[PDB]
Design a protein around this ligand. Sequence first.
Ligand SMILES: O=P(O)(O)O[C@H]1[C@H](OP(=O)(O)O)[C@@H](OP(=O)(O)O)[C@H](OP(=O)(O)O)[C@@H](OP(=O)(O)O)[C@H]1OP(=O)(O)O
Lengths: 103, 137, 67, 402
Amino acid sequence: DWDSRKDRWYGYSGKEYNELISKWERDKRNKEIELMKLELYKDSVGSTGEGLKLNELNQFARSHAKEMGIRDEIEDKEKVQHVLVANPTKYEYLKKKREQEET
Amino acid sequence: NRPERIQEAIAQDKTISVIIDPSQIGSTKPLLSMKCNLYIHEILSRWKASLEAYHPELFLDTKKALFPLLLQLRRNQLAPDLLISLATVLYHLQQPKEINLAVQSYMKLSIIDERTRLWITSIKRLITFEEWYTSNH
Amino acid sequence: KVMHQIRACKDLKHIIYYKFNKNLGKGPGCGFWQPAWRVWLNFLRGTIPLLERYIGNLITRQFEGRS
Amino acid sequence: QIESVTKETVHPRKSYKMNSSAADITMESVHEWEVSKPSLLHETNDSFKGLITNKMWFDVQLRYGDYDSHDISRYVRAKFLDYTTDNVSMYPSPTGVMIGIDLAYNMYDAYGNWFNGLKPLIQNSMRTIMKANPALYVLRERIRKGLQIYQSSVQEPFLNSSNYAELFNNDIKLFVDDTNVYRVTVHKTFEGNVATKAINGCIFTLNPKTGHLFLKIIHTSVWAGQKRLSQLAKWKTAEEVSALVRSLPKEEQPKQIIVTRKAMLDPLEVHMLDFPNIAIRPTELRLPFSAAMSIDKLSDVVMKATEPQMVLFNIYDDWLDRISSYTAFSRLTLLLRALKTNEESAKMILLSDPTITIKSYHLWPSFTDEQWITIESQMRDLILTEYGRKYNVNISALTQTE
RNA sequence: GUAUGUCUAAAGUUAUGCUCUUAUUUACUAACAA
Ligand SMILES: O=P(O)(O)O[C@H]1[C@H](OP(=O)(O)O)[C@@H](OP(=O)(O)O)[C@H](OP(=O)(O)O)[C@@H](OP(=O)(O)O)[C@H]1OP(=O)(O)O
């Protein structure tokens, strides 16, 4: 137990700290015009989310993919229709016009 | 005493052209200050209408953040380097087709810094609201 | 070589304390700085020549260039 | 019943200065408080003498213990009634509170006077902070790295291709790349060896919702100060980002910050310690934003830059107007991707038609949506082509994989 | 990345077979990226 033995302060009531309070408690006992208004005239006088709609569109990516070219085709469909689903901005319109027909 | 400070000020508050000349920045001072100071008051009033549409909680402290500027501007305590950057933001904020130029000017204003941050940040909310305000209108 | 001096001081402390704390318990409150002080004086005695030479040469170099 | 909680701004020295201490927080009261006699936190029987205080103070006292000085309570007590009862660095009241954190052992403790019903709050507070302060967590993680025992365990998963959807969710965000901060002109020397010289760069600082690409243009003047610039690039980056965040309001302070370079996360963590609410997101998915700066007008602006300035843009304008942000971002992603593969090809695709004109504000050429679609398709083909060339397996791709 | 070494840092001294276009190698170098 080193730091206990080192402890410059050890084994004491605050006899020295009460004398500090006594010295300072004695010291306790011993002891705009328009601009304020100019500013305060104005009121103060106190003083998931949209990515779910993507997640639906990416679920709609599953639809066109599930229609044409899932697994059987290596390149001819599942890669070609892969290029034509989810990646391009046009896939917004492909769903949007299906929504517009659904309306 | 205080009554004539109400009378003279509120009369002066309704007596201004809400315009910033982009060439008068080169000139030397209270004219650009009070132009901006009372242009901000219009940005305050346009807020005051659609406080139900917009989120009002942050504005209640935005007011307290703006209070320094008011005290700076009507006195000309605000520095030239700050003021030139500041007025540059407010001028671009007037034209609806300077929204790039608005936040552009705000970023170059921001880039001691304890309440200065607070109020300068509060100005960004004024652009943020105004940019939205002109959109949803 | 001041380790010798330091060691001596340590030894003194060990000696002193355990003649100073026979019936008295442990703690830091012992003074009695005499013999250690003596040690340090003798160390200074030893070194005063050494530092006269060393710092002598040093300030000479500062003033006169080195040989 | 506290009138004001003011921070007494001390020198930077105070943090680590040990001979003295000015009080960190000063506590102006509403009424007189009647604080207890000084005591430790876990010392329950706090004695309420007749002495009162109109004002307290809170001091922190960081320490780094050893195998011998590994109790904190004693130390903190010592510190308290050392600095009080010392005629250097006086506190406004001699009555106050002092916290001390043993960083070497995660042994918090605090000593000092106690306002009634305060102690529990402080105890709980310390418990909370120790459980998870950002700075302290960083420290532990730093030490952990130092000892190569880093348990790779994250609470929030990375931005992979699946979670890409849930990137954005009516939630204010920001996105960061530090790739083109330190660009170099390679030029010969008299000796014959290469000499690297810095060029102006950028801080690719994008917002996928609004499409507001901030980018503070790094003037070469900031490199002229120092050496070892690859690390310094990261630091300036994170610094700049931090500054930007500070500038913006609590609402517009972006929540989840995404970073391209996972190495540049490490100093960002540090400069994000200014504000703890801003979560960090190490992207698993590398996005092409090195090639982002090879867009014509962007590069132009970068070259133009004369000083420490930022010149923000809307990375996509017309696209927002037409469609939701995500759609725009996909197109953008494709474009940047293509650029990364090959700049010449990209530009060619963009300027295949010379009749089309890039709008004065816009970074990109304003196309009609069907021709736009075609362009996108072409770009995609370019990417696939690149893959075929390099990866040599671009034909038999699964959907998600693709 | 360095040792180290140069450089700058403001005041006026009184005289009348080839050119071309390119693509490829190899080498070296590179506190630039991987
Ligand atoms: O033997 P040293 O390495 O010189 O250390 C001694 C020794 O402490 P350790 O026994 O733990 O090493 C003394 O302890 P005792 O043998 O007397 O029990 C202790 O003396 P006190 O007990 O009188 O304190 C003294 O401490 P101090 O210097 O405060 O007198 C301390 O020296 P260090 O503190 O320099 O280690």
